[PDB]
Design a protein around this ligand. Structure first.
Ligand SMILES: Nc1nc2c(ncn2[C@@H]2O[C@H](COP(=O)(O)OP(=O)(O)OP(=O)(O)O)[C@@H](O)[C@H]2O)c(=O)[nH]1
Ligand SMILES: Nc1nc2c(ncn2[C@@H]2O[C@H](COP(=O)(O)OP(=O)(O)O)[C@@H](O)[C@H]2O)c(=O)[nH]1
Ligand SMILES: COc1cccc(-c2cc(NCc3ccc4[nH]ccc4c3)nc(N)n2)c1
Ligand SMILES: [Ca+2]
Ligand SMILES: [Ca+2]
Ligand SMILES: [Ca+2]
Ligand SMILES: [Mg+2]
Ligand SMILES: [Mg+2]
Lengths: 425, 440
């Protein structure tokens, strides 16, 4: 059960690099690819994300994609730059200019075949491919436009494999350009059809967390990516380390996705870091269900949970987590749908993340994620009703009905979340 | 890679190019002979400065520029001036008789004889590029060459280089230095003809530059050298994103995405600060907040107009020097709570920011003081239409009597081109009005 990782664009490759830095440290792999760890539990599932190369060297099963070489050159020079397989760097020269059309139709189409070639070589070397994960942003052009193009191409060649994504949603408080709502709306319509799980990482929340909670006056993209890498590590701990949980991507999707289109999750993490005081199990459970620890700028009390999964890391009383986990149920029992019995899952991993005795990762399938899509839809319509900045896209061959269609599909997605939010037994 | 070719057309374009490339050489440590000791990659490279300079095996750094004028006296000063060695002779192109402030002569009569040579010389520069980005065209509205030949060139570049991007730096006529009654005619004719061929045009009002030199530099009667050296600073701030790199550097193209909502609405208003004499600058270092506030005082704009009585479609701040985001965000917060900054209802009100750490440089013996930090604001405001209105009014006064029109008809133009161009300006003025109305 191997996973193939893909990171596309500026945002996708930076959060992807941090990810490989974090889990590489947890598995005991050094920047050169040599193992110098203390426990054999680190290696029992190293194959899930790493290939074993000549010389007992471990190489991430990762593909790096971008339409301009800038960020990828930085990655090759970064701390863990030399660990990636050099032939897995696939880049163009021009770029996408924060244009979904360039990444999806013109500039990205020129490069997509070359990317799929590397996918095949990685998949052919898989004993039993389990699925794919993609890291990318939805506000730019390469990760947004070409990223969804890659997903459509992968579902063509591997139609029976799981396709999941860690997608960074744009926010005006952290914005590079104004056409970000356009690109996001066009990308989400693709994710509704061609992904099994999409973790909605909202830059609005990451900023509010760095500023309000962590008290960071001037947050940088590096500060936000520290939160993202920690969460992705927590989400993947159920596959990367050997508990008595037989977790496969498809089995996890079956347990979390009651309806095919409603597969957009709210990530969460606790404690929030950037101290030494030991955190208590009651504190971990109370923080991980708090809105201030959510990676999507949505209020869970404004919607209802379809399914929930809590992952605890460290050595703690498995009895005490159950008591506190069962306790929190009552404090928000109204916010859990009663027509999916026992819809809250709990997993425990004995291995803690770096420099934390105990941590908790939160994955929620809540109808309150609808708030995020409304926000993007509003920003979209504010411009589209005046056809502002459309020339950037029509110049690349797109028609205006493609914008209208994408708009309607997201409003449909919003309405679908609303019917189940009001549904009762 | 991602090279830019600069084209300097006419007296204004050439002399402004002189000041700009002089400033570029100082900022990058390039000597008048083209040598740059700090570049260890001889004869080539992919450095940021290589977007504006090519390299020879002998170590010379040659501007990716073409100078063109229909008479030779101005480019002759380049051929014998301090930076003669910088340019290969083929980059300096001259005719023998000028356009006599007649758009027709620059576009048709005289421009026709030299256009092919210019395009061939431009092609020789493009063939040296691995990933050419676009063109920077420097010219005046009022001159016969700056207006007529530029229009012809822009038309021909759209044919030879499809939609490859083309940016303008245009000199808007001001009576304090404009010595030609027909400059309104040429201005409308060229603005009409290039509108479909320009992706982004930065207009510089000589009156605005004139007042800034008089007010802030205490120059009783500025010269073209005073004006151009100031213009170079604005040009440098706009192009610094392409010539330098860093972690806070935002490419000009990324700014351009925010500044052009509609293809026709591609005229950003530029504001620059600080412009301060060395006598004042002494014992008075300006902060990030102070220079940012200056960006909203209309007395510092490149074009005379009132943003307070218009609406914003975009606001970009390009800092260079000793600037960090914390101070920028603080200054923007204070400005938002104190000043008249209204956006159209159909675009976000955020400010796009970029920072270059390389500090500003000044030409030896100039009037500008060397400062530790500076800023250029690029804003898409409807108020810029005031410049079209003033110019269109002067056009109407003379054209109602057909004054001076015979000079254009004598060179082969038809009255219809005048009315066709004026009507396009009327639509442009109406377009700006439309974009500012609130939605329904
Ligand atoms: N800012 C600035 N404007 C200039 C400069 N030189 C000329 N101009 C402007 O150019 C106009 C006069 O026309 P010219 O520039 O001489 O015309 P040309 O482009 O050289 O072509 P001709 O019509 O043949 O002379 C006036 O409106 C001036 O304001 C200059 O050095 N700096
Ligand atoms: N968290 C995070 N978000 C980023 C980063 N860089 C860009 N983004 C987001 O992505 C959007 C810009 O898209 P971009 O990264 O340029 O897309 P690309 O052109 O495919 O690389 C912005 O709205 C940001 O919110 C980063 O380093 N970290
Ligand atoms: C994006 O790629 C990945 C990669 C690795 C993991 C995941 C992931 C983790 C997860 N959390 C743990 C969990 C949740 C519910 C459970 N039920 C029974 C065991 C069990 C365990 N839940 C989901 N859906 N995916 C997704
Ligand atoms: Ca191509
Ligand atoms: Ca192929
Ligand atoms: Ca070099
Ligand atoms: Mg970017
Ligand atoms: Mg002349």
């Amino acid at each position: 059960r191997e996973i193939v990782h893909i990171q596309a664009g500026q945002c996708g490759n930076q959060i992807g690099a941090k990810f490989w830095e974090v889990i590489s440290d947890e598995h005991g792999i050094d920047p050169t690819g040599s193992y110098h760890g203390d426990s054999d539990l680190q290696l029992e599932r190293i194959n899930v994300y790493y290939n074993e190369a000549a010389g007992n060297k471990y190489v991430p099963r990762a593909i790096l994609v971008d339409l301009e070489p800038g960020t990828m050159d930085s990655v090759r020079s970064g701390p863990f730059g030399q660990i990636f397989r050099p032939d897995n760097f696939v880049f163009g020269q021009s770029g996408a200019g924060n244009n979904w059309a360039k990444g999806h139709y013109t500039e990205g189409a020129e490069l997509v075949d070359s990317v799929l070639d590397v996918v095949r070589k990685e998949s052919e070397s898989c004993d039993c491919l389990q699925g794919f994960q993609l890291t990318h942003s939805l506000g730019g052009g390469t990760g947004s436009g070409m990223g969804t193009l890659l997903i459509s191409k992968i579902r063509e060649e591997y139609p029976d494999r799981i396709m999941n994504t860690f997608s960074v949603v744009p926010s005006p408080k952290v914005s590079d350009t104004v056409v970000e709502p356009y690109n996001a709306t066009l990308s989400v319509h693709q994710l509704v059809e061609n992904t099994d799980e999409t973790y909605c990482i909202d830059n609005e929340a990451l900023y509010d967390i760095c500023f309000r909670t962590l008290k960071l006056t001037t947050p940088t993209y590096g500060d936000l990516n520290h939160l993202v890498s920690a969460t992705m590590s927590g989400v993947t701990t159920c596959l990367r380390f050997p508990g008595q949980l037989n977790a496969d991507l498809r089995k996890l999707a079956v347990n979390m996705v009651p309806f095919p289109r409603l597969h957009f999750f709210m990530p969460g993490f606790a404690p929030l870091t950037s101290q030494y005081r030991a955190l208590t199990v009651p504190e971990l459970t109370q923080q991980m269900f708090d809105a201030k620890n959510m990676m999507a700028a949505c209020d869970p009390r404004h919607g209802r949970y379809l399914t929930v999964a809590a992952v605890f890391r460290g050595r703690m009383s498995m009895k005490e987590v159950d008591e506190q986990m069962l306790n929190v149920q009552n404090k928000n029992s109204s916010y859990f749908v009663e027509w999916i019995p026992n819809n809250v899952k709990t997993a425990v991993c004995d291995i803690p993340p770096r420099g934390l005795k105990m941590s908790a990762t939160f994955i929620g399938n809540s109808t309150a994620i609808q708030e995020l899509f409304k926000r993007i839809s509003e920003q979209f319509t504010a411009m589209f009703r005046r056809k502002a900045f459309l020339h950037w896209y029509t110049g690349e061959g797109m028609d205006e009905m493609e914008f209208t269609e994408a708009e309607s599909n997201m409003n449909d997605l919003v309405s679908e979340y609303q019917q189940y939010q009001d549904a009762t037994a | 890679m991602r090279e830019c070719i600069s084209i300097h057309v006419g007296q204004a374009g050439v002399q402004i190019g002189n000041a700009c490339w002089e400033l570029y050489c100082l900022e990058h440590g390039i000597q008048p002979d083209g040598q740059m000791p700090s570049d260890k990659t001889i004869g080539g490279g992919d450095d940021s400065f290589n977007t504006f300079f090519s390299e020879t095996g002998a170590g010379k750094h040659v501007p990716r520029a073409v100078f063109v004028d229909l008479e030779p006296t101005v480019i002759d000063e380049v051929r014998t001036g301090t930076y003669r060695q910088l340019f290969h002779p083929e980059q300096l192109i001259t005719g023998k008789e000028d356009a006599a402030n007649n758009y027709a002569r620059g576009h048709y009569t005289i421009g026709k004889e030299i256009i092919d040579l210019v395009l061939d010389r431009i092609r020789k520069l493009a063939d040296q590029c691995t990933g050419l980005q676009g063109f920077l065209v420097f010219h005046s509205f009022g001159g016969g060459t700056g207006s007529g030949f530029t229009s012809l060139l822009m038309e021909r570049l759209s044919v030879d280089y499809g939609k490859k991007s083309k940016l303008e730096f245009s000199i808007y006529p001001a009576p304090q230095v404009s010595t030609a009654v027909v400059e309104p005619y040429n201005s409308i004719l060229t603005t009409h003809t290039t509108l479909e061929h320009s992706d982004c045009a930065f207009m510089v009002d000589n009156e605005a530059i004139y007042d800034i030199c008089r007010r802030n530099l205490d120059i009783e009667r500025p010269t073209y050298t005073n004006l151009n050296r100031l213009i170079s600073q604005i040009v440098s701030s706009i192009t610094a994103s392409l010539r330098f790199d860093g972690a806070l550097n935002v490419d000009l193209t990324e700014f351009q995405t925010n500044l052009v909502p509609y293809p026709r609405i591609h005229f950003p208003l530029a504001t620059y600060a600080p412009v301060i004499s060395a006598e004042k600058a002494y014992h008075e270092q300006l902060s990030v907040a102070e220079i940012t506030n200056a960006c909203f005082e209309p007395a510092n704009q490149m074009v005379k107009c009132d943003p307070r009585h218009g609406k914003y479609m975009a606001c970009c701040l390009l800092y260079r020097g000793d600037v960090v985001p914390k101070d920028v965000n603080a200054a923007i917060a204070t400005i938002k709570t104190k000043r008249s900054i209204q956006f159209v209802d159909w675009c976000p009100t955020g400010f796009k920011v970029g920072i270059n750490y390389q500090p500003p440089t000044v030409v030896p013996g100039g009037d500008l003081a060397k400062v530790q930090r500076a800023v250029c604001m690029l804003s898409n405001t409807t108020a810029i239409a005031e410049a079209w209105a003033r110019l269109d009014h002067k056009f109407d006064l003379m054209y109602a009597k057909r004054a001076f029109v015979h000079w254009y008809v004598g060179e082969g133009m038809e009255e219809g081109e005048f009315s066709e161009a004026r009507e396009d300006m009327a639509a442009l003025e109406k377009d700006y009005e439309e974009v500012g109305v609130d939605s329904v």
